[PDB]
Amino acid sequence: DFVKVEDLPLKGSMKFVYKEEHPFEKRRSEGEKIRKKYPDRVPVIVEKAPKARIGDLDKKKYLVPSDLTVGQFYFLIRKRIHLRAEDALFFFVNNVIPPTSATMGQLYQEHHEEDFFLYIAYSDESVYGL
């Protein structure tokens, strides 16, 4: 009689493959150096959120203009995974859905980790950030 709820992603369960394959000191060195080389851009890691049903992202490392908006970055990722116009896409930054009106520079200055990278997870649904 019970509706079993077993298909929703655990909050905070996202694990970035980028951090499992690159130690902190290597990431921190590259992030700090790329921020000095391009002070008007931010380095971003984008990977698929848990239990998402959506196409794979071939590349995870992006150097984005700080003045690019989140809505424009949604546009970029949609094309790279070849989403249909009707397909949904959500971003998550520290377990929260960022405002589409924010700039990537605003997200970076608020949410970048100590390795100087900004981490974004993506999914076809919003559950992971609610």
Author numbering: -12 to 117
Give sentences from the paper.
We identified one main LIR motif (PCM11955–1958:FVKV) in the C-terminus of PCM126. To elucidate the molecular basis of the PCM1-GABARAP interaction, we determined the crystal structure of the PCM11951–1964 LIR motif bound to GABARAP. The structure was solved in two different space groups P212121 and P43 at a resolution of 1.55 and 1.86 Å, respectively. Both structures displayed identical canonical LIR interactions comprising PCM1 hydrophobic residues F1955 (Θ0) and V1958 (Γ3) deeply bound to HP1 and HP2, as well as three hydrogen bonds formed between the main chains of PCM1 LIR residues V1956 (X1) and V1958 (Γ3) and the main chains of GABARAP residues K48GAB and L50GAB. On top of these canonical LIR interactions additional specific contacts were observed in both PCM1:GABARAP structures. Within the core LIR motif, V1956PCM1 in position X1 formed a hydrophobic interaction with Y49GAB of HP2. Notably, the adjacent C-terminal region engaged in multiple interactions: (1) a salt bridge between E1959PCM1 (X4) and R28GAB, (2) a large hydrophobic contact between L1961PCM1 (X6) and L55GAB, F62GAB, L63GAB, and (3) two hydrogen bonds between the side chain of Q59GAB and the main chain of P1962PCM1 (X7), as well as K1964PCM1 (X9) through a water molecule. However, in contrast to M446ATG13 and M359ULK1, the side chain of K1957PCM1 in position X2 was partially disordered and the aliphatic part formed only limited hydrophobic contact with GABARAP. Most of the residues interacting with the C-terminal region of the PCM1 LIR are only conserved among GABARAP subfamily proteins (R28GAB, L55GAB, Q59GAB, and F62GAB) and LC3C (L64LC3C and Q68LC3C). Thus, these residues may be critical for stabilizing association of the C-terminal region and mediating selective binding to the PCM1 LIR motif.
